[PDB]
Enzyme design. Structure first.
Site, mmCIF file in Angstrom:
data_model
loop_
_atom_site.group_PDB
_atom_site.id
_atom_site.type_symbol
_atom_site.label_atom_id
_atom_site.label_comp_id
_atom_site.label_asym_id
_atom_site.label_seq_id
_atom_site.Cartn_x
_atom_site.Cartn_y
_atom_site.Cartn_z
ATOM 1 N N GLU A 260 0.815 -1.211 0.000
ATOM 2 C CA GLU A 260 0.000 0.000 0.000
ATOM 3 C C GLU A 260 0.854 1.269 0.000
ATOM 4 O O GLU A 260 1.945 1.277 0.562
ATOM 5 C CB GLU A 260 -1.008 -0.009 1.154
ATOM 6 N N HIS A 278 -6.833 0.508 4.914
ATOM 7 C CA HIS A 278 -6.081 0.388 6.142
ATOM 8 C C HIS A 278 -6.623 1.331 7.192
ATOM 9 O O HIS A 278 -5.922 2.257 7.630
ATOM 10 C CB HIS A 278 -4.613 0.702 5.869
#
Lengths: 527, 527, 104
Positions: A260, A278
């Site tokens: 990410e 997240h």
């Protein structure tokens, strides 16, 4: 002359009120490098969130820095090695996100079972497609928790109130601890077979990465819903998509991604997969707690008091005589854990000979750090023993004796099983370079570097065994650097430990086990 | 208005300096009844040794008494029931004699192995009979410690430095705790067979009395030296004399007697038996410690603080709502321990329903008291949990839940084994009389008085089993007051619990076990 | 509508009436249904019908609007009580049968 606490990221004065009236608190724009570097020379403590990077440059520029405190769980933005290198205590807030993360796992499990996003989208497109949806009920179902650390424990507690049966996989929790929680401990294979829901709660370690791959996905129950709000990649993203598309797993929820920022996952093309960027700790309460936690750690640290949430070793924390032993003793813990049949309920660390005159409580923590490495992330060096004992059910003690039988100093790590059986591993340091040596395993003595890839075999078929093993290894192209082998004092068994230049492929391990009729075969990296 | 601490036996002001400057300390001649009774009305605390008897008369006469403190281990001279009856905290100094007693056990073992008294006597009669004596060397020998409480542990530690191998018998220490001590746990039979020396370190309970009888003495190794500085009678005095005279046990040492004062023992006619008039704690250091211990307990108690060394319950210590539960929960601990295959590593006490609103930490202590009754002397009601955990390796926790499934309140005691297996026993109180009821064992529900002699059988041969059991019992003349029986939900097994009016002779127990093919048969007294 | 909390007790309370009848030596002259605890906050009239129906099945060669007229013509009076107070169980139903001779 009041000590200076520099806050370089967005932490409110109120969030950090646990600091006394005995400190001068200043703020700086941490992300702005010029500002930071200009402000840090005067700092006794530095608090940071995730936006400021505390590298060597920062550290070199802060001559009286005593503490770097990260208000959060991750340590990606801090060079802990450099901080230790300069005697700077690093601290985080290790339990600050646990409730928000547990709640988010549950959020994702429900959102996937009942297709909340898609449903919300249909109404958002001004249509009524009630007939299209079909959810899954949790009551009465079996829920598999993969990893029973703090967060996995909270998830099990919350999910159990939904009337679900909870099973777990975690080789790093004692059976008695799991039983106290009212949770059934299972092999991963058995959890896979039984679970209607799966929530993963592992740390990322190479022991852990991609744990749930295609092979695993294929063992699950048809109709499983699987959630990962733990670490990117624990569940193989492409294998999931395959299993989702094929229909075998009904739904999934993910908060974390192999890499990410993630904007291009194929999973994003799948409705039956709920995804969040997240967000597990994206909560005012979790960010506030991270701050008040770390504000207290900084208070204790400035009060010359003991810092439970410490992540490394820095300052007077440890003598020069003791310091080199930390890493050796960590390796003894790794070794005692590998040589054990299951998780010991406790570690007894015996310190003998000259070292016994030193203050050696930290050695008890090293042993535990080593034993638990498979569930500890690299940056951390210290772990909180009381919390470990309460969370996972394993304790450690230190015992001193004036006399060491042979070396001037030796440390023995005794790993004790719930059944009273004991595994013992010993090391020393000696020499101008203080090389780390493993010197005993279970009453057998030798002198081998505590380093590299080590293969350990307990086996029963003895004659020509050295030849068989060395021949298989060398046919696989594996160099054998050092070796120790002996026939058991009592019994048909024998044991051998070898340092290799590389890991051993599984097929060849199978071949070796077969060749000498092994009952235990392990490969451990002691580097 | 300073609180009055009355010292009624020979404790020096210095011995009791742990009391603050916040108390008025007075002395009285305790043994003189008139003096005592005249001095006690004003007392907030009373410290006593062994010479003053703190009976109901004393208590009735002391209207503001908050604490009776006994500077010692025994409680023979204090009526703890009367003190509890009037809300008076009783305290002792439970660990004050441990080093002096351990040292005296060792003293007696050496004095017997090397015939010190006799030898000293020969020189005292002005003759030189060196050629007559022949001692026994400890190095390399196996030493059996019967009972591994605190003192037995210290004896093992001291004897191990003589180069002796240490084995122990104690069903009330976990295997992991024994392994941490580096001690091998054995059945009593195996200890008997193996030990060159035997040191007994049991408490006196009817579980314990005359443990080592003639049958036991005959299993020992020829040449054994046996020491008892624990409790009178643990080793059968006449059987010892027989074994000593016959030659089979070479020597013995005794500090305690079936009844004391003892002046007429046949053992006193035997040279190879070293004897001392209960001197194990006759040491200035032990008497001083007993005093400074108890002075601190009295400080904590007057400071409204918590008193670890408390022996009973007195004062605000416990609500009226909770109070009646203490005895029930003690009985659940007894029961969970009896129904367990081996010592649980922990007890989980679950408190559910209305009782969950109360302050119920004491219930955790009751459970533990019950579990350990076989090694706890009657007067004591409270035990020190932290010390128990450290000494014997067993812990307890409390968990609350708002909901109780059936009764308005229930307490469940979960005894958890090291292997993660669980034994569950539940009770309630209800009714104008608050009768104590056992209401569940391992998922089976019923309603039986928590009282009297209860026989519990797990067995495999089912048809006509009720008839077989009741017929054997009734042929033995045993009345069956109440009964609960059920066939296992899964498996070939069945279980039954019966309340009887008397104990069951061993032969008949053997007959019953045989008749229904029992795998577990136990008789427990819940009174 | 029989409340969802009450529905599961219908069958139980029937069995209590069966029991109270079989355990009665003589035919009872009265039947009393006592509801205690949490259940006492519900509408439980129908539990009196269930008891009676259990009572009479254990005696006669019986439906829900049948039983009150059957009870009348057999000289059995019924009674239902409700009390929040239960000394042990959260909810409990007692079925009490009293015979002509005063036996209970």
């Amino acid at each position: 002359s009041l000590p200076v606490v520099l806050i370089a990221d967005k932490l409110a004065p109120s969030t950090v009120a646990a600091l006394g009236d005995q400190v001068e608190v200043r703020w700086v724009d941490g992300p702005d490098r010029d500002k930071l570097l200009a402000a840090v020379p005067e700092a006794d403590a530095l608090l940071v969130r995730s936006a400021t990077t505390v590298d060597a440059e920062v550290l070199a520029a802060a001559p009286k820095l005593k503490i770097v405190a990260r208000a959060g769980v991750g340590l990606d933005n801090v060079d802990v090695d450099a901080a230790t290198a300069r005697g700077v205590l690093v601290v985080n807030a290790p339990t600050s996100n646990i409730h928000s993360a547990a709640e988010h796992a549950l959020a994702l499990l429900l959102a996937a079972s009942r297709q909340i996003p898609a449903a919300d989208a249909s109404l958002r497109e001004h249509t009524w497609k009630r007939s299209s949806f079909s959810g899954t009920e949790i009551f009465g179902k079996t829920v598999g928790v993969v990893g029973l650390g703090r967060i996995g424990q909270l998830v099990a507690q919350r999910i159990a109130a939904f009337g679900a049966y909870v099973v777990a996989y975690d080789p790093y929790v004692s059976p008695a601890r799991a039983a106290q929680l009212g949770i059934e401990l299972l092999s991963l294979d058995d959890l896979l077979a039984r679970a209607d829901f799966i929530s993963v709660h592992l740390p990322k370690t190479p022991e852990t990465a991609g744990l749930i791959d295609k092979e695993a996905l294929a063992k699950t129950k048809p109709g499983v819903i699987i959630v990962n709000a733990a670490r990117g990649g624990l569940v193989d993203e492409a294998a999931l998509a395959d299993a989702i598309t094929g229909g075998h797993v009904r739904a999934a929820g993910l908060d974390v991604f192999a890499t990410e920022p993630c904007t291009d996952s194929p999973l994003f093309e799948l409705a039956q997969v709920v995804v969040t960027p997240h967000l597990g700790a994206s909560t005012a309460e979790a960010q506030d707690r991270a701050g008040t936690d770390v504000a207290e750690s900084v208070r204790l640290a400035l009060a010359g008091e003991f810092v439970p949430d410490a992540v490394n070793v820095g300052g007077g924390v440890v003598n020069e005589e003791v310091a080199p032993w930390l890493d050796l003793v960590r390796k003894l813990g790794v070794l005692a854990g590998v040589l054990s049949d299951e998780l010991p309920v406790s570690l007894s660390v015996q310190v003998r000979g000259e070292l016994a005159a030193e203050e050696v409580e930290v050695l008890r923590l090293s042993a535990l750090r080593g034993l638990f490495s498979a569930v500890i992330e690299d940056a951390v060096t210290f772990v909180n023993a009381p919390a470990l004992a309460a969370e996972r059910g394993v304790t450690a003690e230190i015992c001193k004796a004036s006399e060491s039988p042979n070396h001037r100093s030796v440390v023995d790590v005794r790993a004790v099983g719930a059944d009273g059986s004991v595994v013992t591993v010993s090391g020393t340091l000696y020499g101008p370079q203080l090389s780390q040596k493993i010197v005993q395993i279970n009453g057998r003595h030798f002198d081998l570097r505590a380093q590299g890839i080590n293969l350990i075999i307990h086996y029963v078929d003895r004659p020509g065994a050295l030849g068989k093993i060395g021949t298989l290894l060398g046919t696989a192209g594996v160099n054998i650097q050092a070796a120790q082998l002996s026939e058991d004092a009592e019994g048909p068994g024998a044991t051998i430990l070898l340092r290799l230049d590389q890991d051993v492929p599984d097929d060849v391990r199978t071949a070796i086990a077969a060749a000498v009729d092994a009952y235990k075969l392990e490969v451990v990296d002691l580097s």
